[PDB]
């Protein structure tokens, strides 16, 4: 790892390198760092598809909570990644962090109205 606490597959997922994350998977699927961030969280933050659905199929937690209580669905709704939103949605919406906002609320503040319609129905 590293002094702060993180694994290389986290960097690979955040940077969107498919071959590296695939070859490393062939480590922990739900490895959580000192931030509590998951590789699924970083993939949703970067919005880079194939690692998201691979990790979801690899056994990544659907409702993993970081230090801030944000799900990968929360990050995908926040950063405008609607595709990640539905990809996680068919993996199984009312989850709240300490502040207590659903991804609908995150879409509301960020103006991601496209994600907003998907979340309500």
């Amino acid at each position: 790892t590293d002094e702060a606490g993180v694994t290389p597959l986290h960097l690979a997922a955040d940077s969107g390198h498919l071959e590296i994350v695939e070859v490393l998977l062939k480590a922990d699927v739900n490895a959580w760092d000192h931030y509590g961030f998951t590789p699924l969280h970083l993939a949703a933050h970067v919005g880079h598809l194939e690692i998201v659905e691979v990790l979801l199929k690899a056994g990544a937690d659907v409702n993993a909570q970081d230090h801030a209580g944000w799900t990968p669905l929360h990050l995908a709704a926040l950063y405008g990644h609607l595709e990640i939103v539905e990809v996680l949605l068919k993996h199984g919406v009312n989850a709240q962090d300490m502040w207590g906002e659903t991804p609908f609320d995150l879409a509301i503040d960020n103006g991601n109205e496209d994600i907003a319609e998907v979340l309500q129905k």
């Binding site: 702060a4 986290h10 960097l11 955040d14 940077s15 969107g16 000192h34 931030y35 961030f37 970083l42 933050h45 970067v46 230090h67 801030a68 926040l78 300490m98 502040w99 207590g100 103006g111």
Partner: protein, 1485 residues
């Protein structure tokens, strides 16, 4: 190891790069032992190359042991080592600063040691060392860190005794490379007030005419030269400064008044309180300065008066001549503005008619201790007059004639008749003291309605006759001092109407709401009291019950009506003998039994019963009664000869009853004796009591039948369930006390024992190795809980319990005619606590012999000397110091028990001779005679060459249990009981000042006191060393006085009432913190205080960031500082809360005893307090305003501990926060501007729009309205949602990718994920930072940027801040906020940044955490936790310099808060000061 290599580098200082290989040093302690520091210093100072510098620093990193490296480096004065090592840590440890000051050096080094942290005592010592050596630079910087107060804009100089002062000393007082080396090695690893109090300035002629600071001080406005040694003050200086108006130069040695000092520009409060001006002080004429307000020209050689004031001064308000030598009759005194004048302690015979009939506004005339007999026509404007201790024969008529008298105290006067209020003509009388006087009549029935406002009336030590109920017409009365009359012995029931009284001085004359409520009840209904106690007494079984039948286990309480008297048939079996003194009440009349069948033997054998009766109830008549006349009557001979009133109780009758015939005479005599009792001439068989008591007694008697027979003990609420009478909360305690005195029920504490027969039959039923037993409860279920406490405390079974070089031990005797009834069974119970580990103690029925070692033992036995009729106890103890302590403690316990249980014994023969044995090479010696022989410290017989020290034989008398260091020397002390040498009054005595091996060391002289209370006070005061405690120096026995340290700047009450502007926001908190620390130490010592108040807190220095500021004075309650229930343990905290309230208030709760005295007590009964900020207008101060509310809880179990309150006070958040403003609920704000303006709507506050600037607005649609998607503003710059610009539309430099930050400190900004600067100058890409931290943080919107030497970049929803070099234009690094958070729900997402000029950056996390940081060292100062849930915007506002913080209390509640700009400096200062205080506390022991 190898000195050859170090010898090689010795040459390599000037040698070529050959020294670089010396690499080999870091390849492999004691390297720095010889000279390594100096060689490396020539290396890095040899024109510094970086390639060799890096390896040299890498080798040096092995050194970082660290302290000794500095110690060797600090030997040679050199700023580079100074700064580098201070940056590396390692300065006030060894000292070091003193030796650097002693050695020749340069200002830079001493400045480094001073500003890097240095103990105040060490700095003072170094300064004193350097004073002698000629210097003007090092001492100048020493003063900077020692005695400078920029916050108050003043320069103090007190306790540090400087020899003299010169202008060059106070020059700056009136208003790099090492860091690079340290960082890379770490990487490898106008003045207002001037104080001159204690500086023994022989002269002040140095800075008088013209100097560097003469022009600077020309507008000083406040100068202090008190406690000094000045003489003939130079008139040049007074011309030099032309703004001084607070000069107070007292205690100096003057000869004649300058009279040119008054020629100052505008001077007020001129104080010369101890200067010895000559006989004449007539001011020089032709100087009309109308500026002086207070003129304390006191304590002088002034036979005459300053007959210059009327011509010269026009506003001499407080013209004071107290304590002068004023002898002759004063001048007509034509001044027209005199407000307050004093002439106390002068020598005045009288005053002329026109002496005071010139001033139209004299309101405070007073002349204490003068030979005054007439008072000539005080003007009507007067309100307060103090004329006590004068040769007054009658009240002068002029005093009766002024319309507006308020307070008059004419104590220590010899007058006969005080005029009635029909002559006073004043309806505003407030306080009237008439103590030490001969007054016999208090005629007030003439006109009482005139007297309505009188509050405190004092008549102590007066020969009064009776109190007329007409004085009950008085309403506002608060304190009636009627003690020491010895002639009244009565109380009119109308006194009950005076509910406002909270104190009553009844001493030697025969409290508060209890007595007054009792008088109210008696006034409402008074009935004669008919109930007396008749305790029959026997001996080992005789005609006891048989006599009662004609007219055994326990006491068998019975009722016998005739008035009604109850017979208590006490026990005859010796086993029951232990508890009997518990029922021998003072108000009763005892019988006895002879059993004359035994003849002469029994009457003498029963003598100890009379001895016990005399010991317990001395004033109780006894009726001796024989009970065996059926079967030798010569016992009457001894009864008349030896058994009479000689030494035994006041026998009143003796009879020879048979068992019939003589029972009629017995009954008649019993009735006659009971009826004619007259206890202290009171006839208490027919006294008057309220009918409420009788009704309650009837209720209890009725409930006796209707009660559980097995356990008739009723509960506390069972008394309430009985009541349908009328008794309030306060009536019940005194009622049950009286009923218990009448022998109806017992109550000592939530249960009332009715039917005393059951209690005294069961509680003593336990009586029926040897004597020891464990828990073996039998017969009779939840009783044990109180049963064990009752039995053990009252009766292991002490009863029936197993019936040497002569110079190294001390023995004492306490001979008594007999051992009192329950003596040993309580003495051995008390002597189970004494100690300097459980000792071993084989205590029998009459001994203890408890010991820890051969050097620590105490043996209290039962001595039976040969040819000694009476029995006595011998106490032995080794002559060591610990043995003396033990002896003192045990003898104190003995005399306390005697005085608290057998007052008849120690009543002046005295039936108690306390022998102290001694042997020069044993000889009896009276302890009273030993005390009388206190004139010397050595006792010698008629033969003179042999003698014994006093402390060796009577360690309890002369202080030997206390440390020998506490031993005053008479030749040094100068404690004179003068009426000004005193500093204040308190508790059991007063405190004065005197010279004792020091400057002005205080002396606590004792008032009536005793060496028994003195022992307790000394033992509690000593063996307790703490910075917040007022440590004592010595003790003496001649006055029997104590010696204490000085509060240099006075007491807290005086501070509040006089100088309220000298209290800073950091001074009040420091005082509170130190008082809390002292209270914490007191509680950790398991001692309560219950005395916290401004009168009791002492201040030493007014320097905010000092090491000692406040201390707590004498500690063994108060109307204005009352405890919740104790004064109206955790009670101390509530008193502490009151202290905090007034300090926060600065004189509101105090200075509230003049317009409404009782209002400081009559509204805090249970958790009722006004809001301080709104009530008093003081500066807002939250987080302590909540602390007082949360500490002074009504429930004592809910109040926090003193340690907890000290810990909460130990937080700079409590010191730096100044406001906490809330916002309406469910309201959200996302922006504020520099009153405060916030954010389709808009909000405003006084102390959907996106952002605002100052007046600019803007919403999500980016409306370009003109008023007086926009994403960022500045002040004129505008940023949009896709990277635009505006210089308004003067110019629009498109760069986009939203612009979101714009800052100035050539402005800088941000757009998307790229930083610009300016006409775009440098658009440095920032997304290329994925190698460190997640790529997502690098590829994100940039929210805020601040401009400084470096560039700090914050991006939205990022837990990491980036730093980019300004010149190098490269990523300098990353600071991870979460790392700080993990060290201490936490979010860590950066939302806003703020920069401070002291290189401190404050970062706002998404959560309620504010990270403090230092750019110089890149180290966290602290984390502001507990604050809120979110943080959105922070910006500096010049209100005072403070930056606000916004947050939501998510339910949504937005909140605003204001923090002081000095948060990190305050944190460092508090952390250094607490550590210094802790080290001082450790060093005190």
């Amino acid at each position: 190891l190898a000195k050859i290599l170090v010898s090689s580098l010795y040459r390599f200082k000037d040698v070529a790069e050959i020294q670089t290989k010396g690499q080999t040093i870091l390849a492999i302690k004691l390297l720095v032992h010889h000279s390594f520091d100096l060689v490396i210093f020539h290396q890095m100072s040899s024109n510094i190359d970086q390639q060799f510098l890096n390896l040299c620093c890498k080798c040096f990193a092995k050194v970082a042991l660290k302290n000794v490296m500095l110690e060797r480096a600090c030997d040679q004065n050199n700023s580079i080592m100074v700064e580098c090592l201070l940056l590396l840590g390692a300065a006030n440890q060894a000292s070091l600063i003193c030796q650097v000051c002693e050695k020749e050096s340069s200002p830079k080094l001493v400045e480094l040691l001073l500003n890097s942290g240095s103990r105040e005592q060490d700095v003072r010592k170094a300064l004193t060392i350097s004073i002698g050596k000629g210097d003007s630079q090092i001492i100048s910087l020493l003063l900077r860190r020692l005695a400078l107060d920029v916050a108050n804009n003043s320069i103090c100089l007190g306790g540090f005794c400087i020899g003299k002062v010169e202008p060059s000393w106070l020059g700056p007082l009136f208003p790099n490379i090492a860091s690079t080396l340290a960082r890379m090695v770490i990487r490898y690893q106008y003045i207002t007030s001037l104080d001159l109090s204690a500086n023994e300035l022989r002269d002040i002629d140095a800075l008088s005419q013209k100097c560097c600071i003469s022009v600077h001080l020309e507008h000083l406005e406040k100068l202090e030269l008190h406690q000094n040694a000045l003489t003939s003050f130079p008139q040049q200086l007074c011309e030099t400064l032309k703004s001084l108006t607070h000069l107070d130069l007292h205690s100096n040695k003057f000869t004649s008044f300058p009279s040119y000092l008054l020629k100052m520009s505008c001077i007020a409060n001129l104080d010369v309180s101890r200067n010895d001006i000559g006989p004449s002080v007539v001011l020089d004429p032709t100087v009309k300065c109308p500026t002086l307000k207070q003129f304390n020209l006191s304590y002088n050689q002034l036979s005459f008066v300053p007959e210059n004031l009327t011509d010269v001064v026009e506003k001499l308000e407080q013209l004071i001549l107290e304590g002068n030598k004023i002898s002759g009759i004063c001048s007509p005194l034509r001044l027209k503005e005199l407000k307050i004048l004093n002439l106390s302690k002068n020598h005045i015979s009288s005053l002329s008619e026109n002496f005071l009939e010139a001033c139209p506004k004299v309101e405070s005339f007073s002349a204490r201790m003068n030979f005054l007999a007439a008072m000539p026509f005080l003007p009507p404007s007067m309100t307060i007059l103090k004329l006590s201790q004068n040769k007054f024969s009658c009240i002068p008529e002029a005093i009766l004639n002024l319309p507006h008298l308020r307070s008059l105290d004419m104590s220590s006067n010899d007058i006969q008749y005080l005029p009635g209020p029909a002559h006073w003509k004043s309806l505003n009388l407030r306080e009237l003291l008439f103590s030490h006087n001969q007054i016999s009549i208090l005629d007030l029935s003439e006109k009482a309605y005139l007297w309505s406002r009188v509050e405190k009336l004092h008549l102590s030590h007066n020969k009064l006759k009776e109190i007329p109920p007409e004085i009950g017409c008085l309403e506002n009365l608060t304190s009636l001092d009627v003690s020491y009359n010895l002639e009244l012995r009565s109380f009119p029931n109308e006194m009950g109407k005076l509910s406002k009284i909270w104190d009553l001085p009844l001493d030697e004359l025969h409290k508060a709401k209890d007595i007054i409520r009792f008088l109210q009840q008696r006034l409402k209904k008074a009935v004669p009291y008919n109930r007396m106690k008749l305790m029959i007494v026997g001996n080992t079984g005789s005609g006891k019950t048989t006599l009662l039948q004609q007219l055994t286990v326990g006491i068998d309480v019975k009722d016998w009506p005739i008035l009604v008297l109850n017979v208590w048939d006490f026990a005859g079996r010796e086993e029951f003998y232990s508890t009997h003194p518990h029922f021998m009440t003072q108000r009763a009349l005892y019988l006895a039994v002879y059993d004359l069948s035994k003849g002469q033997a029994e009457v003498d054998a029963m003598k100890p019963w009379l001895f016990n009766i005399k010991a317990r109830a001395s004033s109780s008549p006894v009726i001796l009664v024989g009970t065996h006349l059926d079967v030798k009557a010569c016992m009457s001979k001894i009864t008349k000869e030896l058994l009479n009133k000689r030494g035994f109780p006041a026998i009143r009758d003796y009879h020879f009853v048979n068992a019939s015939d003589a029972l009629a005479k017995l009954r008649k005599t019993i009735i006659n004796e009971s009826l004619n009792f007259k206890i202290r001439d009171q006839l208490v068989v027919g006294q008057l009591i309220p009918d409420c008591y009788v009704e309650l007694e009837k209720i209890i008697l009725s409930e006796r039948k209707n009660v559980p027979i097995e356990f008739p003990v009723i509960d506390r609420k069972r008394l309430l369930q009985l009541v349908q009478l009328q008794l309030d909360e306060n009536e019940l305690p005194h009622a049950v006390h009286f009923l218990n005195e009448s022998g109806v029920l017992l109550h000592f504490s939530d249960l009332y024992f009715v039917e005393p027969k059951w209690l005294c039959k069961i509680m003593a039923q336990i009586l029926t190795p040897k004597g020891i037993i464990s828990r073996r409860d039998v017969e009779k279920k939840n009783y044990m809980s109180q049963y064990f406490k009752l039995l053990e405390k009252f009766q292991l079974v002490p009863s029936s319990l197993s019936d040497c070089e002569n110079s190294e031990i001390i023995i004492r005797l306490y001979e008594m005619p007999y051992f009192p009834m329950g003596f040993w069974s309580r003495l051995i119970n008390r002597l189970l606590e004494i100690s300097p580990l459980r000792p071993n103690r084989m205590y029998w029925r009459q001994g203890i012999y408890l010991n820890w070692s051969p050097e620590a033992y105490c043996l209290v036995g039962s001595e039976v000397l040969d040819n000694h009729p009476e029995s006595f106890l011998k106490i032995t103890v080794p002559s060591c110091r610990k043995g003396c302590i033990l002896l003192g403690q045990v003898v104190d316990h003995i005399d306390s028990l005697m005085e608290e249980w057998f007052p008849g014994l120690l009543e002046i023969e005295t039936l108690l001779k306390k022998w102290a044995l001694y042997s020069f090479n044993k000889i009896l010696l009276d302890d009273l005679m030993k005390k009388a022989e206190e004139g010397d410290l050595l006792v010698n017989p008629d033969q003179p060459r042999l003698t014994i020290p006093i402390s060796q034989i009577a360690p309890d008398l002369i202080l030997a249990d206390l440390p020998r260091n506490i031993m005053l020397n008479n030749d040094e002390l100068e404690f004179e009981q003068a009426p000004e040498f005193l500093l204040g009054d308190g508790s059991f005595g007063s405190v004065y000042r005197a010279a004792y091996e020091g400057e002005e060391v205080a002396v606590k002289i004792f008032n009536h006191t005793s060496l028994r209370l003195l022992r307790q006070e000394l033992v509690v005061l000593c063996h307790l060393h703490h910075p917040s405690l007022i440590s004592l120096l010595a003790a003496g026995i001649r006055p029997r006085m104590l010696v204490m340290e000085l509060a240099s700047k006075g007491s807290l009450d005086r501070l509040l009432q006089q100088d309220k502007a000298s209290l800073t926001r950091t001074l009040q908190h420091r005082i509170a913190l130190h008082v809390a620390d002292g209270l914490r130490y007191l509680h950790s010592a398991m001692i309560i205080y219950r005395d916290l108040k401004p009168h009791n807190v002492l201040l030493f220095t007014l320097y905010p960031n000092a090491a000692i500021i406040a201390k707590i004075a004498d500690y063994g309650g108060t109307p204005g500082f009352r405890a919740p229930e104790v004064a109206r343990q955790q009670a101390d905290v509530y008193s502490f809360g009151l202290l905090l309230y007034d300090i926060l208030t600065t004189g509101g709760r105090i200075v509230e005893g003049l317009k409404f005295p009782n209002e400081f007590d009559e509204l805090e009964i249970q958790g009722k307090l006004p809001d301080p900020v709104k009530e008093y207008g003081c500066a807002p101060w939250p987080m302590v305003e909540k602390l007082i509310k949360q500490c002074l809880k009504e429930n004592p179990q809910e109040r926090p501990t003193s340690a907890q309150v000290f810990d909460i006070l130990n937080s700079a958040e409590l010191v730096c926060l100044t406001r906490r403003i809330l916002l309406p609920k469910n309201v959200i704000v996302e922006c504020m501007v520099a009153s405060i303006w916030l954010g389709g709507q808009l909000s405003f506050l006084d102390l959907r729009i996106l952002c605002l600037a100052l007046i600019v607005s803007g919403t999500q649609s980016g409306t370009l309205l003109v008023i007086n998607s926009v994403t960022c503003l500045y002040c004129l710059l505008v940023g949009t949602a896709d990277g635009k610009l505006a210089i308004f539309p003067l110019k629009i430099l498109n760069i986009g990718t939203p612009l979101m930050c714009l800052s100035e400190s050539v402005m800088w900004g941000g757009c998307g994920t790229k930083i610009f600067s300016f006409t775009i100058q440098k658009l440095i890409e920032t997304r290329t930072s994925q190698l460190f931290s997640y790529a997502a943080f690098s590829d994100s919107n940039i929210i805020t940027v601040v401009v400084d030497t470096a560039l700090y970049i914050a991006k939205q929803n990022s837990p990491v801040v980036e730093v980019w070099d300004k010149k190098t234009e490269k990523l300098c690094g990353l600071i991870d906020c979460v790392h700080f958070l993990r060290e201490v729900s936490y979010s860590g997402r950066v939302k806003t940044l703020c920069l401070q000029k002291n290189t401190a950056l404050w970062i706002g996390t998404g959560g309620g955490h504010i990270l403090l940081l230092d750019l110089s060292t890149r180290r966290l100062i602290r984390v502001i936790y507990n604050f809120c849930n979110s943080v959105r915007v922070m910006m500096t506002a010049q209100l005072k310099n403070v930056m606000l913080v916004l947050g939501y209390n998510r339910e949504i509640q937005s909140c605003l808060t204001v923090w002081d700009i000095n948060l990190p400096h305050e944190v460092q200062n508090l952390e250094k000061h607490i550590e210094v205080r802790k080290e001082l506390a450790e060093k005190m022991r």
